[PDB]
Design an enzyme around this catalytic site. Structure first.
Site: not given
Ligand code: DSD
Ligand code: DSD
Lengths: 230, 228
Positions: A16, A18-19, A41, A44, A203
């Site tokens: 989260g 902002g990639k 990607k 996913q 935003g």
């Molecule tokens: C669910 C998330 N948004 C992301 C996956 C994040 C895994 C984090 C694992 C960790 O470091 O604990 N999935 C993704 O980018 O497709």
């Protein structure tokens, strides 16, 4: 002239940060600069909750060259999301192939990770850092301007350096208006650690094709975007 | 030292429950008949309430509470120092403070500010550097939240990059009920490293008697005893 694509892996100091919007914004800026962009990607998760970063990038930036591979329903780490679905992780070679098939002269290819740098994407323990080494990519790292960002940024840059993966710079994924004390000092501190390529207005993701392109072009130094591909 | 009498207590980031971990380990060690000191050389966010040594004293009954600098603003020490116009401590100050606390029969816990690579002293000196100078191991506080696996691996890499030992992980706050991600992360973390404790969510609000009971249950007393 450059006979091959430039590859950037776009990683983040965490989840989260902002990639996706960063991939969209850099794609848009590069496209407006006359550079052909592919976004990729390879892994996913969270597809059962609606997550689809490639589709969001298409929406935001108008990118058509979107390359996916593995998609897992649950919003967790790939390993756990794969296990939950009774599936497996892709192989290291499949991820590398997915990227290498995108090769065109002077193309900019953005490879978006899942979570942060050391999340396992393939077995055993293959991360986006390993992929970047395989493909000779540089890493653009998306960061916040929030408290805690300096430790996470430095951890992430140290891990890149440990496998001689080149750092392309930082992007602040969300930049507040107005910037508070912590945010303002963090932006300056981050700029002592590495080049800050952009700090996207908070935003930005809810902007709209026209305003997103305008935001994107203003957000990056054109000289840096221009140099990306030769 | 022939024993792990000094542990630096770091975290994967901010707000992971580092202080309560320090308190719970101090409490468990006390109940194992071990002498405890807690050092937080640099502290920020005081003006917004935070005196971590006082909460350790209160939760755990610890009287040997040592620190060097306290900043008002809830910022990185470096930024707080710049804002106040008052420089951080020097390296040798933090290192000697810790080394002087160190005693046979005593567990000395050093709480960092934020995560491992936060600057604590002048210039660019981190808790990792301090740990190097004093030959301490590092106890790593983690969340059970999404993102913990990356942050934990990153932290453990940074420890091993300067050859500071991993003495293990502690989950600072263990949710109730766990939930799908937390549940999976607990087993995933355990594959990565030994989980010394998982502190129940809300433990920071217990009074000293309940906190003591939680703490004695949370850690393996034979591990705790072995430190000293
Ligand atoms: C669910 C998330 N948004 C992301 C996956 C994040 C895994 C984090 C694992 C960790 O470091 O604990 N999935 C993704 O980018 O497709
Ligand atoms: C204000 C916080 N609680 C903490 C300082 C966190 C610094 C984080 C710096 C960063 O990594 O961006 N202060 C402290 O533990 O005393």
């Amino acid at each position: 002239f450059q006979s091959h694509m430039t590859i950037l892996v776009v990683t983040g100091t965490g989840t989260g940060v902002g990639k996706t919007v960063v991939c969209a914004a850099l794609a848009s800026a590069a496209r407006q600069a006359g550079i052909d962009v592919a976004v990729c990607k390879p892994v996913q998760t969270g597809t059962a909750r609606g997550d689809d970063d490639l589709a969001e990038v298409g929406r935001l930036a108008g990118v058509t060259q979107l390359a996916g591979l593995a998609r897992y329903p649950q919003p967790m780490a790939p390993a756990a999301a794969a296990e939950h679905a009774g599936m497996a992780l892709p192989a290291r070679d499949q991820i590398v192939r997915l990227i290498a098939d995108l090769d065109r002269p002077g193309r900019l290819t953005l490879v978006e990770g899942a979570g942060g740098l050391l999340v396992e994407l393939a077995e055993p323990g293959v991360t986006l850092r390993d992929v970047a080494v395989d493909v000779a990519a540089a890493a653009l790292v998306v960061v916040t301007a929030d408290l805690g960002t300096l430790n996470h940024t430095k951890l992430t840059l140290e891990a890149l350096a440990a496998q001689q993966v080149s750092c392309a710079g930082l992007v602040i994924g969300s930049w507040p208006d107005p910037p508070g004390l912590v945010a303002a000092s963090n932006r300056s501190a981050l700029a002592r650690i590495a080049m800050v390529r952009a700090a996207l207005p908070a935003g930005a993701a809810s902007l709209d094709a026209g305003d997103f392109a305008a935001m994107s072009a203003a957000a990056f130094d054109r000289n840096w975007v221009a140099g990306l591909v030769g």
